[PDB]
Design a protein around this nucleic acid. Structure first.
Ligand SMILES: [K+]
Ligand SMILES: [K+]
Ligand SMILES: [Mg+2]
Ligand SMILES: [Mg+2]
Ligand SMILES: [Mg+2]
Ligand SMILES: [Mg+2]
Ligand SMILES: [Mg+2]
Ligand SMILES: [Mg+2]
Ligand SMILES: [Mg+2]
Ligand SMILES: [Mg+2]
Ligand SMILES: [Mg+2]
Ligand SMILES: [Mg+2]
Ligand SMILES: [Mg+2]
Ligand SMILES: [Mg+2]
Ligand SMILES: [Mg+2]
Ligand SMILES: [Mg+2]
Ligand SMILES: [Mg+2]
Ligand SMILES: [Mg+2]
Ligand SMILES: [Mg+2]
Ligand SMILES: [Mg+2]
Ligand SMILES: [Mg+2]
Ligand SMILES: [Mg+2]
Ligand SMILES: [Mg+2]
Ligand SMILES: [Mg+2]
Ligand SMILES: [Mg+2]
Ligand SMILES: [Mg+2]
Ligand SMILES: [Mg+2]
Ligand SMILES: [Mg+2]
Ligand SMILES: [Mg+2]
Ligand SMILES: [Mg+2]
Ligand SMILES: [Mg+2]
Ligand SMILES: [Mg+2]
Ligand SMILES: [Mg+2]
Ligand SMILES: [Mg+2]
Ligand SMILES: [Mg+2]
Ligand SMILES: [Mg+2]
Ligand SMILES: [Mg+2]
Ligand SMILES: [Mg+2]
Ligand SMILES: [Mg+2]
Ligand SMILES: [Mg+2]
Ligand SMILES: [Mg+2]
Ligand SMILES: [Mg+2]
Ligand SMILES: [Mg+2]
Ligand SMILES: [Mg+2]
Ligand SMILES: [Mg+2]
Ligand SMILES: [Mg+2]
Ligand SMILES: [Mg+2]
Ligand SMILES: [Mg+2]
Ligand SMILES: [Mg+2]
Ligand SMILES: [Mg+2]
Ligand SMILES: [Mg+2]
Ligand SMILES: [Mg+2]
Ligand SMILES: [Mg+2]
Ligand SMILES: [Mg+2]
Ligand SMILES: [Mg+2]
Ligand SMILES: [Mg+2]
Ligand SMILES: [Mg+2]
Ligand SMILES: [Mg+2]
Ligand SMILES: [Mg+2]
Ligand SMILES: [Mg+2]
Ligand SMILES: [Mg+2]
Ligand SMILES: [Zn+2]
Lengths: 240, 15, 110
RNA sequence: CACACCCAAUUGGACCAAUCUAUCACCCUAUAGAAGAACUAAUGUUAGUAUAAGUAACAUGAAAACAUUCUCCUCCGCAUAAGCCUGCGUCAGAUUAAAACACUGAACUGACAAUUAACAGCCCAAUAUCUACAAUCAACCAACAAGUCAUUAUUACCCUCACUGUCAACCCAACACAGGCAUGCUCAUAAGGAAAGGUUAAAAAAAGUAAAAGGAACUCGGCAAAUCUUACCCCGCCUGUUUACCAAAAACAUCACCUCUAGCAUCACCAGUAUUAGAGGCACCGCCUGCUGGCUCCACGAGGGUUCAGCUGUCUCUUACUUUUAACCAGUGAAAUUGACCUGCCCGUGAAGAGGCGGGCAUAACACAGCAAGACGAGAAGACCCUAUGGAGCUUUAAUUUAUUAAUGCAAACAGAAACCUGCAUUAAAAAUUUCGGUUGGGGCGACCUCGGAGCAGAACCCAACCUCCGAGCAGUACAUGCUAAGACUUCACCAGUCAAAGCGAACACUCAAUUGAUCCAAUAACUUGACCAACGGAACAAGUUA
RNA sequence: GCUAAACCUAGCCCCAAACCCACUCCACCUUACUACCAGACAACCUUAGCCAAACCAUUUACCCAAAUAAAGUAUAGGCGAUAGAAAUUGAAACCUGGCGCAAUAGAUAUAGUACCGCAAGGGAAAGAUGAAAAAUUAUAACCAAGCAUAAUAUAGCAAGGACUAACCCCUAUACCUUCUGCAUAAUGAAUUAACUAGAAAUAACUUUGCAAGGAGAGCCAAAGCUAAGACCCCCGAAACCAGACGAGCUACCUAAGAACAGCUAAAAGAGCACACCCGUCUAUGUAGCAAAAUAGUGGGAAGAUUUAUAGGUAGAGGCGACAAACCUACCGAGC
């Protein structure tokens, strides 16, 4: 199929970029993910998940002032428009973020810990143990990939020998370097999971199509059949 | 009891 | 219901050539005393009826040229006049229709 | 007087039409050779023409000077888009079938003519750099589903109006098809049209109107029609969705709930990250429960039942009128069907239900309109089992496989280590090919399939299937139970099986009704051995189900 | 006497021989047949299956470069069905021919046109005067069914025996095929013309030649050997596989658009109710207006709505609010 991905823009901008839906179709044109199609049109707002990105003419710690926290259709959480120096960019907003607040982005690791403020970006080697964190990265310069969803927050369990243990929202531990930059506090839209869809129509507004009507007897346990051993094959079923 | 349908056969028009 | 067998021509001739199917000869034909053309006893002569309609249409065409439009029917009697005639004593206060033709013999002036 | 001259399948002959060739022959033949070599029959093929049948069906508002006017309908019309491509403009024509007509005849043929851009289409120098704040009268207010519209800097550049679409009564449906057909206006027209060819006013049929008294007594059912109407039960929460062309539902989907899987990026998921995503169950909510299950209930329903009242021709019990149809007149003109028919009734007979046969009875010949008892009426579909060593779909602990894919192992390879790739193994996944052995009305449950004996054919042999009943799938004694060889029997074929004199060699053809299994193949030096191949003349290895 | 019936060429088939074609101008890979701008896209990869083995699962012939012979031999093979060499041997080889067809034949062909299908693809029908048409005063007669000429008179498989005589009398249960047995009310046939169905080996037999030899290398022979003559049909599935062609209908999706009066209400997958979409019930219709429509009555009609345009997903699949629905008017697997 003559499928060209809309993700062709190479320069970052805060302008909402028009994106075309896929409908669960891959580049070949066949369905690869079911239940995706239609819904209200959305414009993608590019998010800079690398919080510590100093300007071209600047370096080191810098500060940004929040301009507006608004709704993002693409993601569950809300986003905030911040301005640092002579540029503006989108970031993932925290639970407690307003228009006018000042956030700090630094890569400095001091001898002692520092007072962690919600929304600020500091390396994992300078954050107190136990503080809720979000938007963590595997290695420095990789960018935030984990704990992005609304209300999600990780736990800084321990820090040993330049590495830190991060408790993911799925209650799984992850080991990453202490130089990874993370955001203090939870993510916005804490009560996102408390929403009620209300009607089947609203699920079609989000681009989700109804499930297949086939009665699938197959499942995690029902579909998969344990093969009885020849000794146990005699006792599988007894008439009653 | 399967539905069996036989489409009509149109003869050539030249006749 | 479909025919059980093909009907033969011998059966068909008895039905098709039965006297009821045959055309009945007419005995009411007589010659017109005026023109000599054929006519029936209870029907007006076709030739004599056609000549009246040919003259009637010409008279009705002259009426149209005098009225000069619809919804202009006169409230008086009408008189048809031909070449060489003058309005009569009783033909006073009526609409005279002039015809540039000799009066037909069968058309009697009244 | 003559005499080969009355059987299916099959078999043996003697003749032979037509055709071509060799040679004759020369108003159509002879002797030979050769072959596309002979049609009362395949729901045969093509073509012609009958039958049904001049039947079904089809069509034109009225008068008129053919100027015009009148009656009626308008749920249409006009334009654009798309499509179509000259397809009711003029002229002429031996013209002459558009489902009637037709001289000007014309939605036919030929020629000629035509739709003129302002509308619409066909656009744009480069490189960078910009673009957080909906729409809805956009002002209030109130949102979520978060949205349909923007540049600057520098460089380059000042030539000019080309090209194409433009018609119509039009497109997709085999047709001048009651269908399908986007948008802008008109919302009853200022535009566009004609339901009746003429007649008669039978039945039957369709639609409509009216009805005494009664008001569901009709009926599977208040279906239709009339009226504008109450109360429930069952099922499904609800709006929604589905078998286009017999099922709109109680089925599916559905918020809500629940289970399972996944810790992550440059083409789906996703430019996302467990408050996420995917695979599923169930069908909100509320109550109750386990550590998943049961009731209640709001509205809602072309769901399935029940009911008050009303309503009514649904009915007691039908009737009247109008329209279409109808019948007749004129024009045009099909289809299924059809062995031949010179085509009666009653009893009897008969592949068992007779127009045709037997015995009686009846009987001039023909149309036209009705009827639907028969011609096991006609077409097609389907039901009912059965059969095929005929198919296919689906399912699986049917048989046969891992080529393929994934996860590992070792080898290979690198190598101070590791990976990828490749080869070979091992699991798993998902698939691939193939098959459903017979007998017992069917199904269920069981039995049965080979061999021997009896009831079982009384007396040579054979023979009663199905059926009834009892057995056999051994064992024991020998160890010349060695080797050879006349003549015979034979389970109705074959295969296989059985008896046996003499002779050599020894001694001084074992019992037993059945007590059994071919070929191939495998093992072995040879000898010899190997299957409840029991479906027992045996396929090397394959089940179930289809409504 | 109408409809018709007749005709002889057009051309074709099989061989031989010889190795064939494609620039007149203009246009033609973009929406082919379109004068005129930055591309970078590039080709190669075992066939399978039907069928035979009376199932099927290993297997099952398909010119590979010299006719003949070795030879259906050695070999191969559920050692079954069947498959099958080589060493070796070694011939002629002159296109212009026909015991080929003659308009239902011979190529499908007058043409791959008309027409049918979205496409791949399928695929016709027919012509006939004479030396002269610048002779149409033509090109006699006769022939299928069908008709007309010319409807019919008790009664009956339509005929036969007859008879002075059509009928009347007497006698007679249509044909084919399939079954033990068909008048059978079992199958097939309206009718006419044309077309349409028994192909071959070993052995044996028969008739010639020669003869312990036969035969124009090879092969057989205990009278054989050589040659000839003489025996083995037609139509029809559902299927399977390979390669193409299809999402202009429909299923879902993508892009960017459009539509929804009035009223009650309220910021409603709200109510009533047009346009519009759908198709509940009844009736008409059943070769119909229509290979699914019409009239009335109905459900929805601001939404999970309806809809125009372009694009995508293709058959070992797609798509699916699962109906085994739909994927161009036969989808349990399209054409
Ligand atoms: K319902
Ligand atoms: K078979
Ligand atoms: Mg679900
Ligand atoms: Mg479900
Ligand atoms: Mg005799
Ligand atoms: Mg001869
Ligand atoms: Mg023949
Ligand atoms: Mg014949
Ligand atoms: Mg025939
Ligand atoms: Mg009739
Ligand atoms: Mg009629
Ligand atoms: Mg009319
Ligand atoms: Mg313009
Ligand atoms: Mg008008
Ligand atoms: Mg009338
Ligand atoms: Mg009429
Ligand atoms: Mg009454
Ligand atoms: Mg009752
Ligand atoms: Mg009703
Ligand atoms: Mg429901
Ligand atoms: Mg509700
Ligand atoms: Mg509903
Ligand atoms: Mg249906
Ligand atoms: Mg539907
Ligand atoms: Mg229905
Ligand atoms: Mg359900
Ligand atoms: Mg009752
Ligand atoms: Mg009542
Ligand atoms: Mg009355
Ligand atoms: Mg008539
Ligand atoms: Mg016919
Ligand atoms: Mg009679
Ligand atoms: Mg009888
Ligand atoms: Mg009798
Ligand atoms: Mg009858
Ligand atoms: Mg019948
Ligand atoms: Mg059998
Ligand atoms: Mg099967
Ligand atoms: Mg014997
Ligand atoms: Mg057996
Ligand atoms: Mg047996
Ligand atoms: Mg036996
Ligand atoms: Mg069922
Ligand atoms: Mg076979
Ligand atoms: Mg089979
Ligand atoms: Mg031909
Ligand atoms: Mg042909
Ligand atoms: Mg004749
Ligand atoms: Mg008699
Ligand atoms: Mg009969
Ligand atoms: Mg019979
Ligand atoms: Mg027949
Ligand atoms: Mg196969
Ligand atoms: Mg098969
Ligand atoms: Mg489409
Ligand atoms: Mg509503
Ligand atoms: Mg409504
Ligand atoms: Mg759907
Ligand atoms: Mg189902
Ligand atoms: Mg089913
Ligand atoms: Mg189809
Ligand atoms: Zn007269």
């Amino acid at each position: 199929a003559n499928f060209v991905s809309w993700k062709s823009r190479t320069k970052y901008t805060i302008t909402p970029v028009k994106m075309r839906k896929s409908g669960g179709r891959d580049h070949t044109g066949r369905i690869r993910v079911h239940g995706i199609g239609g819904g209200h049109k959305q414009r993608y707002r590019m998010i800079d998940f690398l919080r510590f990105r100093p300007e071209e003419t600047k370096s080191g710690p810098f500060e940004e002032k929040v301009i507006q926290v608004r709704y993002d259709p693409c993601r569950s959480a809300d986003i905030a428009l911040v301005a640092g120096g002579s540029r503006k960019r989108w970031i993932i907003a925290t639970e407690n973020m307003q228009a006018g607040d000042t956030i700090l982005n630094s890569n400095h690791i001091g001898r002692m810990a520092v007072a962690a403020r919600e929304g600020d970006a500091h390396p994992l080697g300078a954050l107190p143990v136990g503080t809720l964190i979000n938007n963590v990265e595997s290695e420095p310069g990789r960018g935030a990939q984990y704990i992005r969803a609304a209300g999600t927050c990780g736990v800084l369990l321990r820090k040993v020998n330049g590495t830190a243990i991060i408790q993911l929202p799925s209650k799984r531990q992850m080991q990453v370097l202490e130089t990874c930059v993370a955001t203090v506090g939870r993510v916005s839209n804490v009560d996102h999971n408390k929403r009620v869809i209300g009607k089947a129509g609203r699920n079609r507004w989000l681009g989700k199509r109804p499930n297949s009507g086939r009665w699938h007897r197959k499942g995690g346990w029902a579909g998969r059949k344990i093969r009885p051993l020849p000794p146990m094959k005699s006792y599988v079923k007894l008439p009653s | 009891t399967k539905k069996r349908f036989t489409p009509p056969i149109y003869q050539p028009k030249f006749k | 219901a479909a025919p059980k067998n093909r009907r033969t021509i011998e059966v068909n001739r008895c039905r098709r050539r039965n006297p009821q199917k045959l055309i009945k000869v007419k005995n009411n034909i007589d010659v017109c005393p005026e023109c000599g053309h054929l006519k029936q006893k209870h029907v007006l002569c076709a030739y004599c009826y056609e000549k009246v309609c040919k003259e009637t249409a010409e008279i009705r065409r002259q009426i149209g040229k005098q009225e000069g439009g619809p919804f202009k029917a006169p409230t008086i009697e009408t008189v048809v006049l031909y070449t060489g005639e003058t309005p009569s004593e009783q033909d006073q206060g009526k609409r005279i229709i002039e015809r540039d033709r000799k009066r037909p013999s069968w058309f009697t002036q009244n």
